[model samples]
Target chain A: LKELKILHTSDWHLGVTSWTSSRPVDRREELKKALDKVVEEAEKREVDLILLTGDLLHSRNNPSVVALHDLLDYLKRMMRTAPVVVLPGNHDWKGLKLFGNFVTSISSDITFVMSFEPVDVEAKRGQKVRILPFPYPDESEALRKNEGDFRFFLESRLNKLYEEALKKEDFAIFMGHFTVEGLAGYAGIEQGREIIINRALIPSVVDYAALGHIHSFREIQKQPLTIYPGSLIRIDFGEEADEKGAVFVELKRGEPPRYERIDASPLPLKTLYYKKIDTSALKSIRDFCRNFPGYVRVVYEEDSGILPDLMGEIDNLVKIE
Target chain B: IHHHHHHVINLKELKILHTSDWHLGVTSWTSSRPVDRREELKKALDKVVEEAEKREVDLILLTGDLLHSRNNPSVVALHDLLDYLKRMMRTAPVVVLPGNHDWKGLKLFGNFVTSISSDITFVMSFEPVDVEAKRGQKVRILPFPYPDESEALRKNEGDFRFFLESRLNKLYEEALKKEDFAIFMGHFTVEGLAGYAGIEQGREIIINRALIPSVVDYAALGHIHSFREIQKQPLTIYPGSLIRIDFGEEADEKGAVFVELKRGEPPRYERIDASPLPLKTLYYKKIDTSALKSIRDFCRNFPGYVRVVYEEDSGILPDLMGEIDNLVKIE
Candidate 1:
């Protein structure tokens, strides 16, 4: 029986420097810390394939030099663990693939699946696996068509990638970075304004699908068993409730695949609204601040008189209004 | 020894106009004039073309950072750049190397558009390039692209700077073997430039004096925003960014380096200036009607925008503040 153990991590917005809050937090290092753990887990589990679905880089500039160094360092380590497969996301540029190409050029293990086409690779026993990587559609191309037509456009675009002989293949995975028909985007999706495709668009032949775009992780399908692993770290306040982690996938030919969530303990972000605060409430919040491992905001009424002294003296860690 | 008009005996002199850090398709910086930033970059490149054509240079060294965006270079910017590259090719064979910013975007761009008449050269490798310029003038160019934390180089977690210096030294060693004028061109921070860019990462990567090899005729550097001559014997230089990228670089001169190269002689070169859109910052301890008038007048009179900075709280009105381009509040 042909089997493949894959480490599926997606939406790593590395070099993300901005925050909804004005607090000067080191978002870049925070992301690196989370991904640093992902690399360790990939090594620890001894996974045979590492599939990074998309958004390896967050910015158009692709982060700073230091950030690129960290990414390359992590990628080189991942290559040692297994062959690394990357899909370019909406935020990613072709340069990311170019960098991946250079860093992993000598080894055939590292593959950038989105050169605007589907790429096929082999697993154990040289078993065939077709990676239908549909990156975010071009904005200009999408703008020309209506919402319904755009979805149809994407559906047909992916449809052509499937060979008539894909029914004979051992496994096929659809990796895409776009909104599904009903999933909420990172920010609230504007009603009647979001571009999305129906789940039924994916052919029945796909054994599994890796999804990106939405920062929150969700199970999109049962058959072919699609999942958005979510972002590597909390990208915004809207993503505060997300469980950030990579998916450990166990695949067997002609069998239902098994997946285990390898979780990461990202720095928690908390917001508290207060009408009034007494000694006990103050003590509780003070105590809460003592143990809080990440960013927090305390927004009270504008008239709250003579607010208590700052907590823990950590610079830019807490915002009180 | 001056030999005139013997094409067989003496190789034609190679005149090179060197520039880097184009950073096209950038926006949001107040220091840049209030216009299409891509057009601003286009103007800068236009100046580059003017200098190349007027000087009648035989070669152009676009050291690195040819673009700002990695993947999504705007349609207008990329289209204009392609047109500019064609124009540059008409003048001289252009050698474009990737800096840190160029990364994947430049690589893809380089791989595209095959050189039609062998007039354009796109260098994406660390391998040395051998070019026979106009009239079969031979030159060896050692291109050092922005060094990746390359899989080939990472060993035992050694000091990166030490590794880089050794690698660069070895690269320069190859130049020593060549009889032609060797130009070592790269886009990375050197020891002297690290402070200018506030790059605390790589420490003292090849000290300023030790950077250029004695055997190398010239070394063209990039990434730093300010023009500098690191050493004279080898004519090591950085022509700086083609435009005023930010307000901090307000004091820096913007331009390109034009060099005349011949075998076994020092490079004769000078800085060719490109007039970027002006950036003026007016600082004050307090804000008042007088300062308000000055800000309004400065914003109205100048074709470029002005930055207004104040120290203490001054009860500045929003309407008055909006009159200026940027505000820097100092404690």
Candidate 2:
């Protein structure tokens, strides 16, 4: 059997600001430029299928008009190249009715998975990749509505979808917008943002698992080839050092899929630095700050005459502390 | 050439229901639930659809403000509307022109023209669309789409009035040469007409009535949420909005206009009321402060949504707000 090529990416976070919400700065164009590169890479490689895991938008429910338009335009372009499958993550709006129609209206090649239904893809001629997608459901609602252990509930659903997909195709893939127990912990993910799941819960019949909801890329398991493409762009300074990119997966019959990460981050990290300046050497202070364009923090004694003069001139400060 | 404006070619008269300002996704200023607002818009659209079907009108003309905002999140509602229009198109063709609130609808519609149902015709440009109402009875529709900031400047060369008149004249002359009946559809404010009573006026593109070419049979106008005829000769009319969107539009008869047009005869229009479920809107009152106790006594039965212009300053403001809080949504 020949190797099947698939491009995996997620979390574009289009139409967002730098730093904080209260102090919003428009960096919409940066994301747009990066997405343009994603298209170029997908077309250049001639990948059989493209998977956009989730958080395609910055705002879950209320994306700006410009952002929605930009996303629609990009999706239209990408669909013409390869079959693109998009699943909604926690950061994406649950109400799919809003902009979902525009997506479905665009092209038959683009499939937006808003449900747990299994979707079959023609990865290549005489080769099929069956995808079972589980979009993010509100955790509290899930708990309140159902009985028994939440993990058991998840396992049952996963088992059911796995059984369904296995019947139809030789290669079965699971796409989820949730965190795995050991994989998320090993990735050093932030608390409260993860929907942790155990690896044992996954069905052995699943050939590959594509996961989202975590912002960092990782290869959690190799047997069935489970991976996260992470966020395509650096969402905040917390993810500053992380290499933002997509995973290229090669699947062959009776063999474990081989996957590699392609670095697609377009913007360079503008790191934060703090320093205590001496009141005596004022010219040295000006010369030192001039070289750095990133976030800077300056400290001085209360009565220092140098502090007042340096306040307005050196402006890109993350914080005083 | 002074052509005799009598007798013409046509099998029968054409009836067009002109309505605009659907504002399909507008939530009340006092209300926060977007879902409820979406349902309200759906109800309003349903009413229009029912009215259109009931009237059995030959054609439907929507002037503008199709949605509340360009980023309006009522996709299902819009889909339902498009679907209804598609169904209606089997019987009558639906024509739409962009209004101010439709921000980028024209641009977006043009891009997705192929994806859209062929039954619905979107007038994104000033191009004259000649549709045969019946066999051998062609009506030339010259649509004037709303121009955004940059377009307004470039199209007018900084003189909007002259440019608008010139364009209208050109379309009117062209229509007269070919089609049996010519109609002008626009989403702009016409000058020298007393707008709907009580609503505060918005900054508008003041169109001169005199500049309107005499050859054009009917001018289907939008932008004003008031039902009235500005002129009778060319038969200019504002069908007003399909629904009363805000408190400012209280008591205004919200409906569509059914225009009956013959080949060379003056067009006649009848207002068909398609008012939605009773809205809790505004009511104005004038009272003396000396009668504060009486005002309080009167307000209990007032049915709220009230604004009092007091002659004397005596009563507490909170008291008035407290009385009407539940009955009427006071902004």
Candidate 3:
């Protein structure tokens, strides 16, 4: 069998234009820096294939197209030297339903899994790397009626694809956007669009399962190397608590493959603590405004006669969301 | 359908002005910056009252998080702002809810509102409150209690999630009895959807679109900062933060939505943008100090906060940080 080296990653929730009190420069730009570093590391080892699992772009609600275009352009510069396969996540195209298509438009050398109808990808001058790309659905058909059964549908679809891919002797890597049941530990129930799929649904026929959607980077299953590359940068404040990174896998014939976690620089969306500061008997609302610490959402219980001027005083908040 | 049964009318054309997340008393280290935010918020709020008067709205829905913190606000400031509001829309009825940020316990804030004009209605804690308009319309007012107060009890007696769900459910039942378009106004988060960061654990925003045990024709919600529909069902919308309080929130327009409700139809969202010295979102390309003609000239027109994402050792950190005069923060 042909030997291959693969890099698995997912959930780059880009278009995360702003955070607590900044334009996401510290966190987002750091992801770009990390991606360049990852490519340099991969070049040193001559990795055969780079599989960017999904969530390449963050949201369709981007205020500026340049932010996303510039980021993808930078990412493509590195993969231009190597074969890369990309899949889309729910966030990348929740509005337009166009994740896989976005990846293909970025570069010609890149192969994007553009459809759930399963497409085969190849690397290393004609060595077959059979792949099935599945983008996450934001709403199930049952979402309208509240009866959408994503589990049964996902199981049957994955099983059919796996059975078909197994007929060939090539290495099969299924790139997907899902929580993969057992991987729920990484996601807060409040954080994600719940699809409630069972772990038993994943077919055993696939060799490597590359995952996205969960922001905390993890390696859940090892038999066929199930990997979650996590987000490019921590877009949400909850993710700050996680140690984020990308995953590297080396594929060889008939033996357990080598997998390693490379350190990624911190670009976290940090949520500071919530504190209650009594404003009763304050001299001036503007004075109260002057005392708040590093970005804050202050609630006043007793109307100390300083709120209107105080609320008026400090307004440039990341979110008083 | 008589909402509060205070008045009877065949069809009530009640216009409700919805607004939320007015984080009062937010200050920046730099005086100019904080003052600028205050002015921006003032413009938005002024516009809120102006439109309310222009449209002759019947009620004002103050969903929640009316204040940024639960601690008593400087009374003069609070008094001045409320005075302005009361003066502008004296005829329109006001519906107020106690949000998590403003009152850790919603009930405490209910007592706080006791001093408010009797004409004003606090819905959550004071049940069966009725507003009868001169036009002979019965408007039932419901304030959201803390989620812990719901009657749908389970094995767990008092947890944040279960209790919040129960309290909200009770509010729904009482409001639904109106038979008119039930407007359940409150400051609570839906499950699986948080308009803001989860700063506290086990405090799920219990208002999941999936868990709507009953139906309310129009739901005015708060607690999230941005003004958008985070939840599809129950028509949940956040009017967003009143001012651009920090560098994190970068959207262009910060304002409230004007809604006109009938008996059976979707609420039309008429978004309103507030005024004053506007806080514009600034994005600057990363450039080396050497490449720039002059850092001062580079930021000539940029009046608001600025973010700089530069290549390491590009040598512009100090000059860019210094020259940008009105910049609230440098990222």
Candidate 4:
């Protein structure tokens, strides 16, 4: 029998537009293009199943209608080729409840992972691929339930899924939408906003661990096949240089699965050029603007009147970074 | 003619439960009552379901505002409505029309209303539907969903009331030809009705009495939180909201109306009172220090979620520990 194939990706961050003045950066087009590439790659590989680890929608309060339509349309199209499983990330608006109601009403074929419950998929004949998802929990939810420590709450849920997955005697994959320690370098989580957990917290019984919440791709461990496919596209200037992709996995009987990351980054939509120059190097403002690709961040040590002149001349040109 | 083996009662008599304004996800904006508010709504829903079962209703009319907000309805509250509908549908057919809140929900989640059981029909426009509860006994319904300002302006050229009458009159003409009994179901306001307990005036759709078509037998109205009969000639009525959502409705009666409609007779309805669930009391009053001779006496009268406004700095006020949640000072 041909081995079971799985496509893993996460953090689409749909509906996020980088346009809030005092800032000139828009990744909406890039994010859309990246999602198209992921759908393209999944069909090209003829993968049996797709795993989307959370933060699918951008804002927690108000989601863009365009984003919701784009994501729903793409998901429906992709379902014709393979089943997609979505877990809730911390950023999914009304993550657990409202988002759940919206998607469940749209399509019942998509497997939505809202809790630690195991959703078993039959990828191959008589071969079961069990998916255990851990959605990022709100701290308020944890405290209200008397499960104080968020990290401990996650670990306890994982431990319970591990016991259940072992009983099924199938190929089990662990999907998480939170951060793990020692891999923060590859993770694009900003400083002081980390929800870190230990690598050991992942159960040893799982065949592979597909992680989300990190915007940069990384293969932190090999023994149990722990990996983060990362954000599908660059979100903003902060994620400008990160390589984006989706991972394709091939699972075999009684063996560690082999997988490959298919880079899905679209052509650089825009560039943010950061440079700190001395006042002496300041040339004609128009000349400097013509050379840069997109947004230009200029830092001058001394006060320069040319800064205001540049801002006035550049119509839709460089945004002060 | 269709024959029913389960129902031995006369086919001409149709029992209907008319209810509206559930506002399932509504929470008192104040911090102390958010959790209790959800519990209160659930209790109200359970009571309605129990009544529907006890009465063996043939049909249920839910005239809008099922949700408090378009997209922010609490998951548990949405589930409450879905679960109640599923159980109620087993005994009768359910028809729902969109209110102001529901129209917002339709925009946000357009396909959400379709997720409900096929036994339930949702009407979101000015369309006439003929429902046959029993063979040869058809009740024609002309539904008037909430027409926002844009829709109102576009349909009526310039007059909002003129547009309503034109659309309503056209449907009334159509119902006259098809069925023996016709009902006008709308989530709008009519003129000359006493306003709800705490609701402000001028917010309702004021329909000219001359515009109400005499061909309509019964008008089941909504968007008002208090139950009142505006006209008795054709038996026009508003069952009011199923539950009191805010202090604006604190003094309103909470219930559903059971209507029995027969061929050639005026519709007769009995308002079935679903005991109003007690909310966390948020009593506000001007304290008279002279009347309250002792601190213990004031504590007995003070509901926990209360705010007291007084000019004097009474020394014994703080001693009413845990009795009053908030204190307000006024000059």
Q: Which candidate is the best by TM-score?
A: 4
**Cα lDDT, all candidates:** 0.68, 0.65, 0.58, 0.65
Candidate number with the higher lDDT (1 or 2):
1
Error of 2 at A131 (Å): 4.4
| A32-124 per-residue lDDT for model 4 (tens digits) | 778888888888888877788857777756777776666666767666667667776774344346545445443434667776778776552
Model 1, position A109, has a per-residue lDDT of 64
What tens digits encode model 3's per-residue C-alpha lDDT throughout A265-319? 6543323232322443223433433554323333334333323343344442233
Q: For candidate 4, give the DockQ.
A: 0.06
TM-score of each: 0.52, 0.60, 0.43, 0.65
Q: List the residue pairs that clash in candidate 4.
A: none
Show model 1 residue runs off by greater than 4 Å: A18-20, A60-62, A91-107, A123-125, A140-145, A161-168, A184-194, A278-280, A299-321, B1-331
RMSD of 1: 15.8
lDDT by residue (tens digit), candidate 4, B135-193 = 23566787887776655345444576577778878876876776556777887767666
Deviation in Å, model 1, residue B160 alpha carbon: 24
Worst 10 residues of 3 chain A by lDDT: A93-102
Deviation from native of the Cα of residue B304 in model 3, angstroms? 3.2
Candidate 4, residue B117: Cα displacement in angstroms equals 7.7
What local lDDT score does residue B189 receive in model 2, on the 0 to 100 scale? 75
